[PDB]
Paper text:
NOX5 catalyzes the electron transfer from cytosolic NADPH to extracellular oxygen to produce superoxide (O2-) in the presence of intracellular Ca2+ ions. Each protomer contains a catalytic core with TMD, FBD and NBD and a regulatory EFD.
These conformations, with the EFDs manifesting a trajectory towards the membrane, could represent its motions during NOX5 activation process. The preTM1 helix, which caps the NADPH-binding pocket, uplifts. Finally, the nicotinamide moiety of NADPH shows a weak density in the intermediate state 3 structure, suggesting the flexibility of this moiety as observed in the mouse DUOX1 structure. In addition, the PhosR region becomes flexible and not visible upon Ca2+ binding.
Author numbering:
A (entry chain C), B (entry chain A): 182 to 295, 319 to 478, 515 to 633, 667 to 719
The structure:
C-alpha cells in the first residue's frame, strides 16, 4: 500500500510538478485576461501552456545529457528512464491543448463574425495532427521505422511556424532549442561512434538475442557499462541502449543480451529468426563500479530485470579472482596470492530475487558456469555464493532478509558491503534490515 | 625564425582575435554616432568595448571549465595555461579604456558647460582604480595573499554599479555572469575537496619543496594527473594546480614537487625554510594515459619543464613491470610472465631534452633510482632506457633525431609509438623525423 506508492514517489512528484505548472500558467493567463469573455481567456491560457510544452518537450529528449545525469544522485531521485514516455505525455497534452486552443479561437472568431495568426495556426494544427497520427505505436509495430522518423521530423516545421505564430514563443524556445541543437552538433557521424561489426548472433530461448559484436581495437569499459547500439538493418536512425554483458577482461568480443521487449528489440529477433551486418555502437556509459572490487565480502543483490550489469560484474569479479591463482612451472606448486591492487574481495554473495526466469535463461546458465568453474575449488574455500529466488514457484519464495543477513554476518570475511539493484521499496526494506547488522549499504543506479 | 612564431601561433591568434573584436566594436560604435562630434563618439565606442571586456574578463577565470577543456584538442589548439595572464591583459585594457572613457565624457561635459551615469561612473572609476592598485604584483610579492583577495573581491561592486550604469550591459553580463556564478555554486566546501594533511615536507635543492601529503582513503588517479593544492597557511583562498609525481600504485602517500617559480610556490619554500599542517586538494584531473601502457616500445619524449607527469608515468610503468616478476616459494624459480591486461610494453625509452637541471634534481635522482633498480636486470634484457640531454653544457647538446630514431628502429620490440610533451616547434620536428620511420606519433596535453 505504501511500497507501491514508494516506488512511484518520484514519477508522481514529477507529474504533480507538471500539472501544477500547467494550472499555474492557465490561471495566471486567465486572470490577466478576465475582461475578454470566456473565449480569449481560455485560448490565451492554452497559449501560455503551449509556449511551455512545445518548447521543453525537446529538452526531454536530450540523450546526450541524460547519460551524464543518469550517473548521479540526481538520477537517484528523479527517474530518467521514463523520459521517452514523459515526452509522449507532453506530446499528448500538446495535442489536447492545441485542439482546445483551436476550438476556443474558432468560437471567438465566430462571435466576432456574427495574416499570420490564423493561417500559421492551420499549418501548425495540420503538422501536429500529422505528428500525432504518424507517431502512434502502429507506425513502428509494423516494420516502418523510417516512416516514423521522417514524418516525425516535422517538429522543425512546427517550431518554425510557431516562431512567427506566437509573439513570445521564441523566448521560451531559445534555451531548450539552443541546448537541443548544441547536443545535436556535439554528436556527429564519428563523434563517439564506432562502426563495429557483428561477429555472431545467437538466438537464445524466450525471445532474447545474443550479439557477439567485435570489440573495436581501442574500447575500454568498466564492468557494468552500457552502449547505444544502432543497426541500420532494423531501424536506420534509432539508437537503443543496452548493457554490455561481458567482463572487460574479455578482449575478443563484446556481448549484448537484447530481450524482445519492444518493437525494435523485437524486430531484431524476428528478422534474425527468419552473421556479419552493420552496427554503430556509441561509447561506454555508466556509474563507476570500483566500490565493488575495492570491498570485502560484497553482497550484491538484484531484483527484477535490471540485472544485466550484474552479469558483467560477476564475470569480471571471477576473472580477476582466477587471475590471482599462480602455478609454478618447475615444481607445479599452485598458490593463491593476496588481494592485489585491483580487487580486494575475500568473498562475494549474489542474491537475485525475481518473479521468474522468463527472459533470463542466459543469466542462469552464466551463473551456473561461474558456480561450476569455482565449485571444484569449493573444498577448501568458497568465493562466489549464488542465491536465486523466484517468488512465484533456487529457493522458491521471497527471501527472509533477517535470516539471509544473519547468515552473511555469521561467517566473517571482512567488512560486509551490501550493494543493491532494484526498486526503492525493496531498497527501504534492505536498508532497514541492513542498518541493524552494520553493513555498509549501497544502491547502484543501473 | 619560424619555430618561435610556431610556438606562439595560438597566442598570437587569440590576441589578434581580441584586437580585431575591439577594432570592430570601436569602429561600429564610431560609425553609428558620427554626428556627435569626436567626444561622444570616442566615449560610446569605449563604452561598447567596456561592455564586452567587463563581462568576459570573468569567463576567462572559469577554473572549473578550464579543467574539462584542458583535456581535449580544443586545448591542443588554443592555450589555456595563459588564462590568468590573458585575464590580467583584459584588466589592463579595461583600465585603459575606462580611463579614456572618463576623459572623453569629461571633455564632453566641459563642452556642454561652456543622476545615475556620472555618479555611478565616479564609483566605477574608483573601484577599478582600487582593483588596479591592489591587484599589482607588489601586493602578493609581500606576504599579503588575503589583502589581494579581499580588495579584489570588489569586482562584484564593479558589476553591480555597471548594471545600472550602462543600459545594455546586463545583456552582456547575463551569459558570463550566470556561467561564473553557476561554476561558483558547483564548487562548494566539500564538492570535490578533500581535507588532506601533509605527512611530511622535504626541502629539495634549488628551491623546490617535496610535499608527501596523506592519500585520502578513497583517492583514485591515473598516472599523470594533477590537483589544485590549497594551503591556508600560505594563502587562504588561492588554489594552485600541481601534478602528482607519484605512481598510483603508491598507496600510502601522494607526492607533490613544487618548484619555486612564483609568489605562492615561493612563499611555501620560504616559510618552511624558516610537519602536519592543513591542505585541501581538489580532485585528480588530466588526460587519459592508457595509450602509453597499452603500447609497445613507447618512446616518451619530454622537453622543457612540463615533465613532472613523466615522473608519475615512469614510476607507474616500472611498478607494473616489477609486478610481473613472479617467484615461486618452493623451488625459488623466478620467471617473468607475459604482458597482462594493464601494461603491454616490451620496451620504454625516455628522452628528456632540457636547458639544464636547475630545478629538476629530484627528477634526475628518480630516474637514477629507476635505472639502477632495473639495471641489475640489464644483463639479459633492458626495459627502461634513459637519455637525458642538456643542450647547454647525459649527452650534452641537442639530440640528432635522425640518429636517435634510427637506433630506436634498429632493435624491434614492437610497434614503436612516440609520445611527446613539449613545444609545438619540437613537435613539428618530431612529426617530420617520425613519419619517415612509421612511428605512431602522439602529443600529450600535459
Ligand atoms: C542503460 C540501459 C540498459 C539497457 N539494457 C538492456 C538490455 O541489455 N536488454 C534489453 O532487452 N533492454 C535493455 N534496456 C531497456 C530497453 O529494452 C532497451 O534499452 C531498448 O531501449 C528497448 O527499445 P525498444 O524499441 O524495444 O522499446 P520500445 O518498443 O520503443 O518501447 C518499449 C519500452 O522501451 C522504452 N524505450 C523506447 N526507446 C527507448 C530508448 N531509446 N532508450 C530507453 N528506453 C527506451 C519505452 O519507454 C518503453 O518503456 C536497457 C535500458 C537502459 C536505460
Ligand atoms: C596542470 C599543471 C600542473 C602544474 N604542476 C606544477 C608542479 O608540479 N610544480 C610547479 O612548480 N609548477 C607547476 N605548475 C605551474 C605553476 O608553477 C603552478 O601551477 C602554480 O600555479 C604557480 O603558482 P604561483 O603563485 O607560484 O605563480 P604566480 O607567482 O602567481 O604566477 C607566476 C606564473 O604562474 C602562473 N599562475 C599563477 N597562478 C596560477 C594558477 N592558479 N594556475 C596556473 N598558473 C598560474 C602565472 O600565469 C605566471 O605565468 C603546473 C601547472 C599546471 C597547469
Ligand atoms: N526511480 C523509480 O521510480 C524506480 C522505479 N522502479 C520500480 O520498479 C518496479 C518494477 O516492478 P518490480 O520489479 O515488480 O518491483 P520489485 O523490484 O519490488 O520486484 C522485484 C522483486 O522483488 C521481490 N520483492 C518485493 N518485495 C519484496 C520483499 N519485501 N522482500 C523480498 N523480495 C521482495 C518481488 O517479488 P514479488 O514480485 O513476488 O513480490 C520481485 O520479484 C516498477 O514498479 C517501478 O516503479 C524501478 C527502478 C527505480
Ligand atoms: N600552446 C602553446 O602555445 C605552447 C607553447 N609552449 C612554448 O614552450 C616554450 C618554452 O620555451 P622552450 O621550452 O625553451 O621551447 P622548447 O620546448 O623548444 O625548449 C625545450 C627544449 O627543446 C630543445 N630543443 C629546441 N629545438 C630543438 C631541436 N630542433 N632539436 C632538439 N631539441 C631542441 C631546447 O634546447 P635549446 O633551448 O638549447 O634550443 C630546450 O631545451 C615557450 O616559448 C612557449 O611558447 C609550450 C607549450 C604549448
Ligand atoms: C502549436 C500549437 C498551436 C496550434 C495548433 C494553434 C492553432 C491555432 N491558433 Fe494558436 N497559438 C499557439 C499555438 C498553437 N496555435 C501559441 C503557442 C500561441 C502564443 C500564445 C500567446 O498568447 O502567447 C498562439 C497564439 C494564437 C493567437 C494569438 C495571436 C498572437 O500570435 O499573439 C491566435 C489568434 C491564434 C489562433 C489560432 C488558430 C485560429 C489556430 C487553429 C487554426 N493562436
Ligand atoms: C513539436 C515538438 C514535439 C512533439 C509535439 C512531439 C510529439 C510526440 N513525440 Fe516526439 N520528439 C521531439 C519533438 C516532439 N515530439 C523531438 C525533438 C524528438 C527528438 C528526436 C531526435 O532525438 O532526433 C522527439 C523524439 C521522439 C521519440 C524518440 C524516437 C525513438 O524511438 O528513439 C518518440 C518515441 C517520440 C514520440 C512522440 C509522440 C508519441 C508524440 C505525440 C504526438 N518523440
Ligand atoms: C567600467 C568602467 C567605466 C568607467 C570607469 C566609467 C566611467 C564614467 N562614465 Fe561610463 N560607461 C561604462 C563603463 C564605465 N564608465 C559602460 C560599459 C557604459 C555603457 C556604454 C553604452 O553606451 O552602452 C558607460 C556609459 C556611460 C554613459 C552613457 C549613459 C548611459 O548609461 O547610456 C555616460 C554618460 C558615462 C559617463 C561616465 C563618466 C562621467 C565616468 C567617469 C566618472 N558612461
Ligand atoms: C571587474 C572585472 C575584473 C577586473 C577589471 C579584473 C582586473 C584584474 N584582475 Fe581579476 N578577476 C576577476 C574579475 C576582474 N579582474 C574575477 C571574477 C576573478 C575570479 C576570482 C575567483 O575565481 O574567485 C579574477 C581573478 C583574478 C586573479 C586570480 C587569483 C589567483 O591568483 O588565483 C588574478 C591574478 C587577477 C588579476 C587581475 C588584474 C591584474 C587585473 C587588472 C586590474 N584576477
Ligand atoms: C508516465 C510517467 C512519466 C513520468 C516521467 C518522470 C519525469 C522524467 C524526467 C526526465 C527528465 C530528462
Ligand atoms: C599574454 C598572452 C596571453 C594569450 C592568451 C591566449 C588565450 C587564452 C584563452 C583562455 C580561454 C579560457
Ligand atoms: C497541462 C495539463 C497536464 C495534465 C497532466 C496529466 C497527466 C496524466 C498522467 C496519467
Ligand atoms: C581593445 C584593445 C586591445 C589591445 C590589445 C593589445 C595586446 C598587447 C599584447 C602585448
Ligand atoms: Zn616452484
Amino acid at each position: 500500500t505504501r511500497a507501491y506508492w514508494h516506488n512511484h514517489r518520484s514519477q508522481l512528484f514529477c507529474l504533480a510538478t507538471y500539472a501544477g505548472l500547467h494550472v499555474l500558467l492557465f490561471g495566471l493567463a486567465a486572470s490577466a485576461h478576465r475582461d475578454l469573455g470566456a473565449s480569449v481567456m481560455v485560448a490565451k491560457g492554452c497559449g501560455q501552456c503551449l509556449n511551455f510544452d512545445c518548447s521543453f518537450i525537446a529538452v526531454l529528449m536530450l540523450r546526450r545529457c541524460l547519460t551524464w545525469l543518469r550517473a548521479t544522485w540526481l538520477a537517484q531521485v528523479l527517474p530518467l528512464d521514463q523520459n521517452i514516455q514523459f515526452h509522449q505525455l507532453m506530446g499528448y497534452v500538446v495535442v489536447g491543448l492545441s485542439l482546445v486552443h483551436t476550438v476556443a479561437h474558432t468560437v471567438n472568431f465566430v462571435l466576432q463574425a456574427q495574416g499570420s495568426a490564423s493561417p500559421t495556426g492551420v499549418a501548425l494544427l495540420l503538422l501536429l495532427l500529422l505528428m500525432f497520427i504518424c507517431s502512434s505505436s502502429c507506425i513502428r509495430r509494423s516494420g516502418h521505422f523510417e516512416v516514423f522518423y521522417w514524418t516525425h521530423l516535422s517538429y522543425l516545421l512546427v517550431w518554425l511556424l510557431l516562431i512567427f505564430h506566437g509573439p513570445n514563443f521564441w523566448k521560451w524556445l531559445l534555451v531548450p532549442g539552443i541546448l537541443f541543437f548544441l547536443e545535436k552538433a556535439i554528436g556527429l557521424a564519428v563523434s563517439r561512434m564506432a562502426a563495429v561489426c557483428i561477429m555472431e548472433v545467437n538466438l537464445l530461448p524466450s525471445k532474447v538475442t545474443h550479439l557477439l559484436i567485435k570489440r573495436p581495437p581501442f574500447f575500454h569499459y568498466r564492468p557494468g557499462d552500457y552502449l547505444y547500439l544502432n543497426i541500420p538493418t532494423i531501424a536506420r536512425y534509432e539508437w537503443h541502449p543496452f548493457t554490455i554483458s561481458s567482463a572487460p577482461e574479455q578482449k575478443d568480443t563484446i556481448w549484448l543480451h537484447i530481450r524482445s521487449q519492444g518493437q525494435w528489440t523485437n524486430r531484431l529477433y524476428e528478422s534474425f529468426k527468419a552473421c556479419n551486418i552493420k552496427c554503430y555502437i556509441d561509447g561506454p556509459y555508466g556509474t563507476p563500479t570500483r566500490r565493488i572490487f575495492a570491498s570485502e565480502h560484497a553482497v550484491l543483490i538484484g531484483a527484477g530485470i535490471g540485472i544485466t550489469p550484474f552479469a558483467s560484474i560477476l564475470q569480471s569479479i571471477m576473472y580477476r579472482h582466477q587471475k590471482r591463482k599462480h602455478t609454478c612451472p618447475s615444481c607445479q606448486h599452485s598458490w593463491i596470492e593476496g588481494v592485489q591492487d585491483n580487487m580486494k574481495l575475500h568473498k562475494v554473495d549474489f542474491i537475485w530475487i525475481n518473479r521468474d526466469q522468463r527472459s533470463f535463461e542466459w543469466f542462469v546458465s552464466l551463473l551456473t558456469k561461474l558456480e561450476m568453474d569455482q565449485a571444484e575449488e569449493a573444498q577448501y574455500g568458497r568465493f562466489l555464493e549464488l542465491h536465486m529466488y523466484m517468488t512465484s514457484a533456487t529457493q522458491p519464495g521471497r527471501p527472509d532478509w533477517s535470516k539471509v543477513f544473519q547468515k552473511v554476518a555469521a561467517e566473517k570475511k571482512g567488512k560486509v558491503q551490501v550493494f543493491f539493484c532494484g526498486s526503492p521499496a525493496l531498497a527501504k526494506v534492505l536498508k532497514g534490515h541492513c542498518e541493524k547488522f552494520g553493513f555498509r549499504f549501497f544502491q547502484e543506479n543501473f
